[PDB]
Paper text:
Nonsense-mediated mRNA decay (NMD) is a eukaryotic mRNA quality control mechanism that recognizes transcripts with premature termination codons (PTC) and promotes their degradation. Human UPF2 (Q9HAU5) is an ∼140 kDa protein containing three conserved MIF4G (Middle portion of eIF4G) domains that are found in a number of proteins involved in RNA metabolism and translation such as the nuclear cap-binding protein CBP80 and eIF4G (eukaryotic initiation factor 4-gamma). UPF2 interacts via its third MIF4G domain with UPF3b and via its C-terminal extremity with UPF1, thus forming the central component of the ternary complex of UPF proteins. Here, we present the atomic resolution crystal structures of the N-terminal (MIF4G-1) and middle (MIF4G-2) domains of UPF2 and a lower resolution crystal structure of the combined UPF2 MIF4G-2/MIF4G-3 domains.
The crystal structure of UPF2 MIF4G-2 (residues 455–757) shows that the core MIF4G fold of 10 antiparallel helices (residues 561–756) is preceded by an ∼100 amino acid region (residues 458–560) that contains additional elements essential for stability. The first part of this N-terminal region (458–478) folds into two short α-helices (hA and hB), which together with the connecting loops pack against helices h2, h4, h6 and h8. The interaction is mainly hydrophobic, involving Ile458, Trp459, Phe467 and Tyr468 of helix hA and Pro620, Phe621, Phe676 and Phe713 of h4, h6 and h8. Two salt bridges are also established between Glu460 and Arg712 and Arg716 on helix h8. Helix hB and its adjacent loops pack against helices h2 and h4 via hydrophobic interactions. Residues 481–558 following helix hB are largely disordered in the crystal structure (apart from the short helix hC) and indeed this region is highly variable between species. Similar to MIF4G-1, the N-terminal region stabilizes the interhelical packing of the MIF4G-2 domain helices. In fact, residues 458–478 are evolutionarily conserved within UPF2, and the expression of MIF4G-2/3 constructs lacking this capping region yields mostly insoluble protein. Notably, superposition of MIF4G-1 and MIF4G-2 shows that the capping helices hA and hB in the two domains pack against the same region of helices h2, h4, h6 and h8. We solved the structure of UPF2 MIF4G-1 and MIF4G-2 domains at 2.6 and 2.4 Å resolution, respectively, using SAD on seleno-methionine substituted protein crystals.
Numbering used by the authors: 457 to 480, 529 to 532, 534 to 548, 559 to 655, 658 to 757
């Protein structure tokens, strides 16, 4: 049993089969989202189409349930699919605000639902999310933005848009320099998709090794109490 509920099994595994359809100090989030937002802002059957796409993107933040987000996918796939439009979608998905963590699972569902008939949405978003992750792992920018990036990767992992091996590499990078911001990013990552990784047979053994290395490290490396407790809680959350 990989999932807790039956709602979870269905939210992550029962997607609408779209392939049945027609072939048709700084003023910042992070620097990555600011740069992406400015690319979006810079820019007549296409002026009508642009209009309906800008409507569509501006409505995404309201698709707060399973039925609403699946509809959005059908709407996009049937009236708006266009190289230029796929790039705008990817970029609107990537600049999700940190204050709407609740969107991440729906945004991941959209991406995974589109993937079988326009994979490049997944490819671009993942590539963007990977690069921002690398950036966060190198610096020391508010922990709350970093946690948005890591949560989004987690949701995408549960949908298999990131492979187990991808996200395990993320975790391994954070365990190499096990410092304050990296410990939290790690614990956020494991809260989001650690059980998926631990329970899945393909990833179980490597997750477990890494979980035990984190526990070994809280004692061994004398972290201050707050992070000792953080690591423990993420551990017992995956491996109770």
């Amino acid at each position: 049993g990989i999932w807790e509920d039956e709602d979870a099994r269905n939210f992550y595994e029962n997607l609408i089969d779209l392939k049945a359809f027609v072939p048709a100090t700084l003023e910042l989030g992070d620097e990555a989202e600011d740069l992406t937002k400015k690319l979006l802002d810079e820019q007549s059957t296409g002026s009508h189409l642009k209009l309906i796409v800008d409507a569509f993107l501006q409505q995404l933040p309201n698709c707060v349930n399973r039925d609403l987000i699946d509809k959005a996918a059908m709407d996009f796939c049937m009236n708006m699919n266009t190289k230029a439009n796929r790039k705008k979608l990817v970029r609107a998905l990537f600049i999700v605000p940190r204050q709407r963590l609740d969107l991440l699972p729906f945004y991941a569902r959209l991406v995974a639902t589109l993937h079988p008939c326009m994979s490049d949405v997944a490819e671009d978003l993942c590539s963007m999310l990977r690069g921002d992750f690398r950036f966060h792992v190198r610096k020391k920018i508010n922990i709350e933005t970093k946690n948005k990036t890591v949560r989004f990767i987690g949701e995408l992992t549960k949908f298999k848009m990131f492979t187990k091996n991808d996200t395990l590499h993320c975790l391994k990078m954070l365990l190499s320099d096990f410092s304050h911001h990296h410990i939290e990013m790690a614990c956020t990552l494991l809260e989001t998709c650690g059980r998926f990784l631990f329970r899945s047979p393909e990833s179980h053994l490597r997750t477990s090794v890494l979980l035990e290395q984190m526990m070994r490290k809280k004692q061994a490396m004398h972290l201050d109490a707050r992070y000792v407790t953080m690591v423990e809680n993420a551990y017992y959350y995956c491996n109770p």
